[PDB]
Amino acid sequence: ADYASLVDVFVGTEGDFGNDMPAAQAPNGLAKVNPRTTPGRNNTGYDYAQSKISGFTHTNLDGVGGSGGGGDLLVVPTSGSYTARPGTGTYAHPFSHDDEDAGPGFYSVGLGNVAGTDGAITGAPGTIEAEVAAATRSGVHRYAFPAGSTPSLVVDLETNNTSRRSSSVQVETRADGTVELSGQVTGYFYNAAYTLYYTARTLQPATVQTWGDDDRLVDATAQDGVDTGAILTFDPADAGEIGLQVTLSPVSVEQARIDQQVELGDLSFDAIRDRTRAEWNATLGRVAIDASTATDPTGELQRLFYTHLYRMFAMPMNATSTSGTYRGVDGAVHAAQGFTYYDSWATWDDFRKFSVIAYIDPALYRDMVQSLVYLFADAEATGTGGGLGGFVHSVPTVRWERSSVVVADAIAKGFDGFDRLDEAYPALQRLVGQYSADELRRGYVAGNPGASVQRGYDQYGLSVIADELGLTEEAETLREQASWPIEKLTKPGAWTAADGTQVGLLTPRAADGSWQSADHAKFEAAGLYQGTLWQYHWYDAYDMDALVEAMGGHEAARLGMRHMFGEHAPDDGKAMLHSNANEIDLQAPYLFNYTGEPSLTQKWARAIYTKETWNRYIATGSSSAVPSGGGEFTPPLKTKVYRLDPRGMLPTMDNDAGTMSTMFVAAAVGLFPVTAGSSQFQVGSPFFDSTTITYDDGSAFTVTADGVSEDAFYVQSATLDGATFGNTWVDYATVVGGADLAFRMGEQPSDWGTDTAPAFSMSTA
Template sequence: MFPRLRLLPAAFLLAACNETPPAGATDGDTSTSGSTSSGATEPTTGSTSEGTSMSPTTGPEEPELPGMFAPEPLIRHVNPFIGTGGSGYGVGSAFPGPQVPFGLARPGPDTTLAGGFALGFSHCAGYHYDDTEVQGFSQTRMHGTGIVDYGAVRVMPTLGMSPDKTDPGGYRVALDKATEKASAGYYAVTLASGIEAELTATARVGLQRFTFPEGQDPVVILDLAHGLPDVETVSGQVEVDAKAGEIRGHHHVSGGYSGRFGGVKVYYALRASRPFAEFGSWNDGAPTAGAPSQEGEAVGAYLRFDPGEPVVIAVGLSFVDAAHAAMNLDAEAPELDFEAARTAAEAAWEKDLARVQVRGESARDFELFYSALYHVLLMPTLASDVDGSYRGLDDAVHTTDGPYYTDFSLWDTFRTLHPLLTLLYPEYQGDMLRSLTRMAEDGGWMPRWPLGTGYTNGMDGESATVVYADSILKGFDPEEVGLASAYAAMRETAMAPVPPGSPYGGRMAVDKYIELGYVPVEAGFSSSSWTLESAYNDFALSKLAEALGEQGDAAMFAERAGYWKNVWDPDQQLLVARSESGAFVPVADPLTWQDFYAEGNALQYAWYTPHDIEGLADAMGGPDAALQRLQKFFEDSEKEVLGLMPQQYYWQGNEPDIHAPFVFSALGDHAGSARWSRWVLRNRYGDTPSGLPGNDDGGTMSAWLMFAALGVFPIAGTEVYLLGSPIFSESILHLEGGDLRIVAPVTSDDAVHSAAASWQGEPLAQPRLLHGDIAQGGTLQIDLGP
């Protein structure tokens, strides 16, 4: 039933992990031997982590655990090509280009099939692994989303300049897949023109190093007229200063989400490592040599260089203005030193990856785990400049004394990514909470999917409530994250509709929700989902009100947290839509999508009360009845054949039911969670470009993999971690309060039945722990058997 991984002797594993992968080995190795970082280049630095030891931590009476710790440097286990492929609803929307953790600059290849064909849905990050041509390297994008946006400031190396190269059809070129390489902080490919392109990044600067064939005519094109599929250019600006060797301007793009608020304007300052031999620009037509300035919807520029050494093109970015983009470039890449930037990027990744050490017997598991951790640390996006300036959701410029982030995919990330950051990277999470508070203060409303500098109103629910509750319950200081201000903004939209003309949409039919106890089907699409999300959000608000001493609010929101019961139809035994008259809407086929659910069907949404799983079980007839139903749900899932469309039973490729494998443990059945979380991990994830179960959604699915691999899973907005089945014999999480060890002497895939679990040597009565238990460190042991 479960695939079994071949176990490796430690000496063989060490040799495998120390082997330099061959160039172009980008598909990933599905065996447990050979290369561990498919397509990754050999890192230029060793480990930069401090205070982390790879020596065994077993006590004198504890038997030696099998396997070995993942060898350093940990970046060798990162495969950025995982999730860059897939088809249909299985597209991962990852990109292989470089960045630093949560950086603004994400230079990467914008690719197409032959002739320039590229479907938007499979190119949300600008890249798909199956593509054969490159039509530029843009500097901005998102990770893992199901919507296309950004793709600003495209540069492209080419040989010679001609009028047809003002359009992608003139400069698009095939790529040599055998030469394509990617690792944490670095990407490289050789184009059919013979030009070698290498990319790296700092926090706010994208660096491209182009090596041209000897004796050819080196040209670099800056195209501000074209971007990613389905993304339009509103305007572009080019100001060439040949003496300074610099181009400044902006690229205003309008994508699937940014188009909702008029698009996002990205400012840039571009510099070259060598003087221009010639330059020119264009505006909706043929290029003009020596023309220094252009502005419009179809503008661009070209730079010609004398033949010789490689050319480094560095692009500083800012949401504030071009002067700040130049300031960022001055601060982060003043010498345009590509190797120094790459070394710094790799060091930044090594430092953050070292927050977790894992011991195992499979090189492939190391690759899956650290590639997931890499994906977790890509988004949200840094949006403040080196002097603390940032453009707020009111389109005004503000200053902050800490990092300010944007691009919060909250409906997705509140479930797994933010709880992971709260646990492992509280310094990042604290800055993100402060960023959300500033958004509410600047723009007037707490957003639910802010992108760049605007409100998008994407998805359902007010998920920031759960993000704050999760962090506050786990020890964040309310004053330090500005909770009082954030709570006031979230309370306002929970109590009344927003005024007409507001940039924020507010809660759907909140007046009806308060009056009836549910969002009626007459309110429009996703009415049932809005009821369930609002109840969950109200649960979170009750916890935040308690933290602020607002006892009246706490009681009110705690009562409203039970409103999910108002859409539970005892006859259908489903959470469904309900009309204003009180009638439940019949579901003819629980396997098909209904208008009253957001991206799911009745069977998947049947488990969507994460804050009240016990109450849901009671509605189903008690824990035993709920467990029997859940078991059948997964047995049916196991039989389902995967295709291009969403799964009809358990669907790991989207968010509403991804907590379901751990509902077993919530109801006291650790064996069920151990078995089915392992099944999901082994059957919905892989080490190939199609190795994600669907859109990674800003790292949400990768964070799920990490929790499942560690054997603990958070219920967001609570202190609870539910137990599963670790795939590593030992994991060490370097927490702020002390090291958390998770020990599992047996990790074989055909031995996932839970035998026992203990915390600090004492047996656990239930398969769960609270954050307060683990925050100061300790040892959790999970014993598994056949």
């Protein structure tokens, strides 16, 4: 019943080992009440390895790179006093993980008391007990200050994980003496600025001073600039209980006030915390697991599952008001009619995650795709022709590449009635871009194999959308162009197998058709972003059949796949050409199903996600967190990719809006989307004796793995709804239809699935 207790919100919160947050948050919540460590932090604002905390920020992004996004609206409890804008060093409180507790919807910590005046503020006797919880749009605070303290909360509106652009604060003192603060914060992350409106009320009487960009702390009730803030001071008689409620809205301050009355009403802190815990239990309860001692002797694998299921329901965030409105990239308010509008995208990294969301929470997935459609429809509506990067966004956000694939994913899966798809389409076309004249002639971008394979997948996705809109002729042209990267950039005999077999591989190609020299295993060679040619080779996952042919046939592919995973040298870390640390070749472990060796897919799926593997590659050039260089672990390292630890992922391995977590869930269920933008899932190695996904109507998908253990991870035989099943892929319809997929597991590889009906490929469909 209480799945929330199995989630460990600290997994991935250390250093550069995931960039996730312990923040109090509701499922897909906008409000993310994250403690802030000092002087070090991860991208979210909390590094587990630290021992001081300043306060709580209310906005954020999960698992992103750079210096993180959001981090707006810092609330810092203190017994100190100020006569000017606070020095940030004065916020610092000792904390200990021994006096810290968190889980779905809540975070609590005992902070060492601090007192004094301005720069003289330092440690003081006693403890500030801090508790926060979250609803969808709101963060609530309860503080206990030592007896005799003059409690104060600093509301710092400059704090941002990357860049504060503008902020404002208006103060109101009501009849009962409580204070309400409101205004806007405008930040920036990666491509775009974003604005959020806020309202924050105290629950006890307070007096207040504000500051603006001149650093003067004054009695004025309004500020508007870049660095602004407010300092709330309470009566010592209220030291036992200081409460604060903060609500966010992409729409307006007054909308935030309405949202707050709707969301929180007169509910107590405990009831708001309790209600969000129940909401998490309902969300997590969509997947019910029975895991024997044999497969999970310590219970950590089940905790790991639920922790990553928790992480899967974070982004995109609910960007809709309680009144059913949202703010568009045109800067105006619009109705999200009959659906919830979500926003905050990092689709270049995360596109495969949506395909998995589709089979865990179909209704949420539908709303997300509809939202993605409205977002592009809105860009088109401006009439400006500009890219999404040129607008101010409704929530912190990242990037939008591969959106065409995600939309196509819902269409291929039989979702329809997507309002405003006709409007979204031309904006999706501009996103994807066109080959230049010279590029059209030759069939590829000169010296840029990465951009070529990427457009190929984008064009496949657009082609699905084109056919749905009845643009048949456009769809044909798109499919033709989408075939080009495979045909034109797979260089024959790029790699020669041990027995002489000639294997073709993605290789940069000059304008005149000459092949360009390249080490196919070198990180970021040939203009590639965050990967190698071997890793990008497999990118055009919508046409494995054409890829197998371009590679030089079945045997060439089969031997290539074996070499990709160093099968000929299992104890040599350097022979590992696959990367676990980035999303570029996420699907690669499941490609053995395509080379007639499904047992190897099963092995690698179970190994990468639940065992120690060889790791040659990190996700970036180098990292101070592990001896590394040139995009590699130096030397290669045998280690678990996923740990139930604050050091949750490999060093440099960012979750990226819950992508790595979502892939873990998919591996655990045993169904992986090699082809996002299709309706198919590839069979892996289900982790648990029984896994049940219950849909909103009470029907359920049940996948069983009879006799599964840490050693018994190979499929021996299978049935589908009682009947012999021999395919290594299943359709989305079969899953959400409530099928019974039953596997028989064993400790040795079998030939199960080696006579599979072919999986989807654009060229053979």
